[PDB]
Design a protein around this ligand. Sequence first.
Ligand code: K
Ligand code: K
Ligand code: K
Ligand code: K
Ligand code: K
Ligand code: K
Ligand code: MG
Ligand code: MG
Ligand code: MG
Ligand code: MG
Ligand code: MG
Ligand code: MG
Ligand code: MG
Ligand code: MG
Ligand code: MG
Ligand code: MG
Ligand code: MG
Ligand code: MG
Ligand code: MG
Ligand code: MG
Ligand code: MG
Ligand code: MG
Ligand code: MG
Ligand code: MG
Ligand code: MG
Ligand code: MG
Ligand code: MG
Ligand code: MG
Ligand code: MG
Ligand code: MG
Lengths: 205, 41, 133, 26, 46, 97, 124, 41, 181
Amino acid sequence: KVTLPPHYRYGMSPPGSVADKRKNPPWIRRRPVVVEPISDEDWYLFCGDTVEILEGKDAGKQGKVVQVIRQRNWVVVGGLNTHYRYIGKTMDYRGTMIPSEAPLLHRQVKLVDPMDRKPTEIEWRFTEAGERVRVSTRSGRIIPKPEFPRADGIVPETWIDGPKDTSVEDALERTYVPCLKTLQEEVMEAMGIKETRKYKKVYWY
Amino acid sequence: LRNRVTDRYFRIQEVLKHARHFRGRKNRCYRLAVRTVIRAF
Amino acid sequence: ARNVVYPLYRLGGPQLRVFRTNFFIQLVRPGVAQPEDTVQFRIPMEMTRVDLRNYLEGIYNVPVAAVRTRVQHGSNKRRDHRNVRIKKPDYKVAYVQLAHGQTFTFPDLFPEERQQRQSSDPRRGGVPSWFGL
Amino acid sequence: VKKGFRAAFRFQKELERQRLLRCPPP
Amino acid sequence: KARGNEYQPSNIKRKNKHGWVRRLSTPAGVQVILRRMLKGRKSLSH
Amino acid sequence: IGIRLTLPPPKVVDRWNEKRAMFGVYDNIGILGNFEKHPKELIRGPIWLRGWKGNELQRCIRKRKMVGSRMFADDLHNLNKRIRYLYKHFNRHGKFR
Amino acid sequence: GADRMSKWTSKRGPRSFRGRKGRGAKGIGFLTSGWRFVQIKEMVPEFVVPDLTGFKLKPYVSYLAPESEETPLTAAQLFSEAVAPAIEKDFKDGTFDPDNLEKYGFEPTQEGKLFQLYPRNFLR
Amino acid sequence: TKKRFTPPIYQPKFKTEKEFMQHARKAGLVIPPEKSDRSIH
Amino acid sequence: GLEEFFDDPKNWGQEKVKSGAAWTCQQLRNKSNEDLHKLWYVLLKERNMLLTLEQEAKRQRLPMPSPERLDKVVDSMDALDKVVQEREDALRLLQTGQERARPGAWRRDIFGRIIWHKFKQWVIPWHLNKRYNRKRFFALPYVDHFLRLEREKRARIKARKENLERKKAKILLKKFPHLAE
RNA sequence: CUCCGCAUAAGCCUGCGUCAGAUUAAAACACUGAACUGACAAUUAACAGCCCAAUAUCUACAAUCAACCAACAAGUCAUUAUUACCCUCACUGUCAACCCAACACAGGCAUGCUCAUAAGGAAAGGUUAAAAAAAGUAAAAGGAACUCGGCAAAUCUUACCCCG
RNA sequence: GCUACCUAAGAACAGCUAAAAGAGCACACCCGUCUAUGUAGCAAAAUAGUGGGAAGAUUUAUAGGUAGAGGCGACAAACCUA
RNA sequence: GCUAAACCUAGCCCCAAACCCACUCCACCUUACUACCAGACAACCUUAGCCAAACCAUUUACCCAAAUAAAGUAUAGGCGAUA
Ligand SMILES: [K+]
Ligand SMILES: [K+]
Ligand SMILES: [K+]
Ligand SMILES: [K+]
Ligand SMILES: [K+]
Ligand SMILES: [K+]
Ligand SMILES: [Mg+2]
Ligand SMILES: [Mg+2]
Ligand SMILES: [Mg+2]
Ligand SMILES: [Mg+2]
Ligand SMILES: [Mg+2]
Ligand SMILES: [Mg+2]
Ligand SMILES: [Mg+2]
Ligand SMILES: [Mg+2]
Ligand SMILES: [Mg+2]
Ligand SMILES: [Mg+2]
Ligand SMILES: [Mg+2]
Ligand SMILES: [Mg+2]
Ligand SMILES: [Mg+2]
Ligand SMILES: [Mg+2]
Ligand SMILES: [Mg+2]
Ligand SMILES: [Mg+2]
Ligand SMILES: [Mg+2]
Ligand SMILES: [Mg+2]
Ligand SMILES: [Mg+2]
Ligand SMILES: [Mg+2]
Ligand SMILES: [Mg+2]
Ligand SMILES: [Mg+2]
Ligand SMILES: [Mg+2]
Ligand SMILES: [Mg+2]
C-alpha cells in the first residue's frame, strides 16, 4: 500500500518510484516545505488547461498544463520554464540532451480567457442547471474543465470487450427481487439441498 | 531566557596570537598557551 | 473460511456448509524434484488438508489421492534502519498427488542504434571535431 | 545554532581579511 | 568456578515464573502489567 | 568551530503593530475611571499569580492550595517535593542566620 | 536470553508444548482412548459450489458503462420494496390484521430454523 | 551529530541497458514498468 | 482441472493483458443472491490464477504482466462481500432489530478499562464452566490510580497536538501574510 | 591428528542451500570462500506430541538371568460388576556449521550407540635460528651437599610421633 | 533456570580382586591436593601435569517448594543469578 | 590538502480554555493474543523511615475544598528544636 513518512517531501517523480526511493529513503528527515493551504473546492487549475506564466525565465508565454501536484501546489507546463539535462547517459557516451520542465507555483501562473488570450482571474459560480463552473472576473465567460486522458490510459470510445469482460447488457441487467431470505436459504432451494436435522441451541458468554 | 557565549572564538585568539611563535602544543592549544603567554608578559 | 466464527456442532445436528469461501490458494513450482503425479500448493494456515481436497474436487473438479501439509517458517532475521527485526510471513505448503494416474508438469509461463555512433579519432589528439576549419 | 548577530558579523569581517591576504587584489 | 552461565533456559520455567497467567494471579502482578502498560512496554510479560 | 559561517536572516520588527501601538493603554483605569477597576485586574495568566508576587517557595505554596486539587498526580508529587527541598534550603542552609 | 518480543508459536517449547499449540485451524473431531482421533463428517465445512455453465457474468466489466451512484441498502428500503406491496393490497381488500403478520413474511422468533439471524449459526 | 560515512566510487561496469536488465534478473532486482501520463517534450 | 490455475496459453509470454473494469458495489445490487453466489466463484478462480502468476514472476525474477488485474479482482471480491453483508444486516434489523450479528456486552477488565466482550459458543451454562469463571470482569480499588495516570497521559498528548497546530498556523502567516482574511 | 563422532532430549529460530554483490574474513594481491546484505527456495508421518463415559468395587507375597541362596534400607507396573457407546487417520514438531558464557571464547552441557572408528578434523602466513622466557629430551663423576621443606623431577620405599 | 536444603517420579556407575563391604586397585563420571603457566587471560577463577573419591551419606537430567525483620545451612557468619 | 566545520527545522516547555471517556472481521486470564464441557479462590486493616533537634529516646511543616486580612496572634511543645 502507501508508506509515506510524516514529513515526506513530494517531488516531480511519483511516490514509490525507484527515483523517489533513492531520493527519499525511509531514514532521511528534511525540513518540511511550507505550502499555502488551498481548499480542494477552491483549486482552479487542472491538467490540459492553458495558463500564462507571470514570473520566470520566459514570462508572458501560454502553455498547456501537463501535470499538477496538489501537495506542493505545483503546475507543470510543457515547453516553458525548462532547463536542459542529458538523458540516457552511459559511462562511454555523454548522452542525449533534452529540455526538462521545472514546476511552477499556482501564483506564478495565471489562467487565460478563451475569448481574449490574456491573463484573467476567475471566481467560481453556478449555471442554470446547477453545475458549478469557474467564471472570469473581467469579461465574465465560462471556462469549462479541459478534457484530459485518463491516468490508466483506457479510452472508452475505443474499448473492445475481451473474453473475460462482461458485456454492458449483462452487467446492467436487473435480476434481483427483494425478499426476506438470505443467500444461504435462497441458494439451498435452487441447488436442491435438503436438511431435515435441527440445530440444537447453545449458550453465548 | 537561555544565554550562551557567542564570541568565544575571539576571546581565545587575542591570547593565541601572542603564542604563534612558541614551540609545541602551547602555540595552538589555549589551555597550554595561556599559561605561557602570561609568563612571557 | 478464515477469520469467521464456526457454528458449534452437537450430536444429531445439521451438516456444516460454507457457500462462499475466502480461502485463496496459489499453485507454485517445486524447488526440488518431485514425482510427476505430485502437485505443490501454498495455502493459508487455517486451511486443512481435508479442506484442500474438497476445495479442489468441488471448485476445480480435480480428483486427489493424497494430501500432505507442512508449515514453513519465515525468517525474522532481517532488520530495518532502526535495527528492528522484519518478519517474513510464515506460510503453509501442501503437496497433492493426483488419483487416476494423471501427471502434472509446471508450465513455462514466461516463454521468449548502438552501432550508429561515431567515436573520437586518436590522430585528432582531442581537438574539437565540430569545427570544419 | 546559537542566537545572535554581532559575533557572526564580526566573524565575516575576519574571513574577508583572511581572503584578502590569501588573494591580495591588484 | 567460572561464573556467568546462571541462565539455563527452560520455556516451562519461564512461562510459569514470569508468565501472563502468573502475573494476573496476584494483585502485585497486575500492578506490574499496569506499570508496563503505562510506560508503553512493547512486551508486558513472557 | 562553534561559530556560524554565514549571517543569520535579518530580524525585522514592526514597531507599529497593534500590540506595540496600544501597549500601556488602560493602565490608569483606576485614577481616571473613578476607581471602578484596578490595574492588577488587567493582568492575565495563571490564576495563582494574578496581582501577586513572591519567591519560588511562596509561588509553589500558593499554587498548591489554589489549583492543587486540579493538578496531575505526577506534577503534584513533584510540587510537594519541590516545597520540601526549598523549605530545607531557605530555613537551614545559607551564609546568614 | 529469550526473545520475549517474538511471536509465540508451536515451533517453540518442548515436545508437549509444540503438540498442544496449533495454527488457527478449526477442529473436525475429538481424541478418544488410545490417542485415536475420530473425525466428524458434520464438522467438516462442506463447499456449496454451483454450476457455472452458461453464466453470463465474468470477472471484469467493460468500461462502456454508466457511472451510477451508490445507494447503500437500508432496512427501510427493503421493507417498502417487498413487504409494503403485499400489505397495501390486503389493506385495500379490507382483510388486514397483526395476527397474519407471519403470513406477510415476518418471523416472530428465530428458533426452529436452520439459518438463524441472531445469533447467526451459519458461515459466509 | 553531522556524521555521514560514504564508500568509494563503485563505477558500474555494464553500460548497456540490456546487460543491466540482464544482470538485474540474476540479482533478483525487479523493476516494474512506470506509469505516468506526462511524457518528455 | 488444473488448467484453470493458469492463463490462456496464448497469453503466456506477453507483457500486457487487456482487462476490463472492476465490478462496482452498485452494479451488484441488481443481481440476485443466486447470481452473486455464482459470480463469487468466477472471481475466486481468476484470483488464484493471478496469485499463481504473481508468485512465479518472483521465481523467474521478472515483473508481473498486469498487476492491476489482481487489484481489480480484489476490489470486486470485497465489493461483492459488502453487498451480501448489507442485505443480511438489513434483514436482521427487521426480524430481530439487532445491529450486531454476534452477541456481546460492555464490561470492565481486570485492568479497569472498558472493552467490548464478544461471546463464544458453549455447551454448558456459564456457572458450570471452570475456565470462564477464572476470568475476571471487575477491577479492584488498586486500579484507580493507574486509570488516572493513564488518563493524564492521554491529556498531555492531546495538549501537545493542539498547541502544535496553533503554532504552525501562527508560523504560516509570517510567510503568507495575505491569509489574515 | 583423531580432544572424537552419529543420533535423541533440551535450548536456539533460517544463522556456510541457489543466484547476485560496492559488503566481509589475513585473504579485491589475480581468483576462490562467506556465517554479512538482497532475492529465491526449503522440513511432507508411519517417529514424536496432542488422549480416555459414569458409579461402585478389586489390588498381603519386591527387584536382582529369579531358579538354589541370603538379606534389609522392605521396594516402579494387575481389576471386577452394571450402565452408556457403529463416523474413524485431523491438528502440531521435523532446516543449519545451532544452546549457556558480552565474541565464530582452550570454559560449561543430560541420554543412546560406536570404544577406535566406515565418522570427524589440521599443530607450521613466510624467513631467520640472538638474549631473556615457556614446554620437553639427554647428560661425565658425585647423589639432597639444594631448600623453610626432597618443592619439582626421577624412582617405586623403612619406620615412628602428634591430631582426628 | 546459579547456589543451599527438600518433594515427585527417572537415569548412570567398564574391568580386576574379594564376593560380606558408607571394602581395595582402576575407566567413564564427580571433586579440586601440589606445582608451573596465565594475571585487561582461552577464562570477571582457565590450561597442563600430578592428585582425592568412584555401589554410595554417590553423581546426575526434568518439574515443583521454602524470600530478605526472611529463607536454607553435616556453622565456613557458608549460600540465596559473577 | 585530508579529517572536519557550518545551518533550522522536527518537535518540546509553561499558561489559558475546555471535564474525560471505543469500534472491520478473527484471537487473547490455559503456557495471554489458544474455536467447543460439571463449576462455587475472591475486595477492604493507623505508612514507615531518612532528615531537624548540631547525639538521641517525646517531638520535627506535607493541598484537602475562597485570594486577602485577622496572624506567624491565641495556643501547642524534651515549653527545646520547631508546630
Ligand atoms: K537560610
Ligand atoms: K538458532
Ligand atoms: K574422514
Ligand atoms: K576458559
Ligand atoms: K523451584
Ligand atoms: K547522627
Ligand atoms: Mg507433519
Ligand atoms: Mg504414532
Ligand atoms: Mg535433523
Ligand atoms: Mg594452523
Ligand atoms: Mg597458531
Ligand atoms: Mg615455524
Ligand atoms: Mg610465524
Ligand atoms: Mg636461551
Ligand atoms: Mg648426571
Ligand atoms: Mg641440608
Ligand atoms: Mg636419603
Ligand atoms: Mg645450605
Ligand atoms: Mg613431589
Ligand atoms: Mg578425619
Ligand atoms: Mg541446572
Ligand atoms: Mg523422593
Ligand atoms: Mg564397578
Ligand atoms: Mg569404596
Ligand atoms: Mg578407592
Ligand atoms: Mg551440604
Ligand atoms: Mg566457627
Ligand atoms: Mg568467624
Ligand atoms: Mg539529629
Ligand atoms: Mg552517630
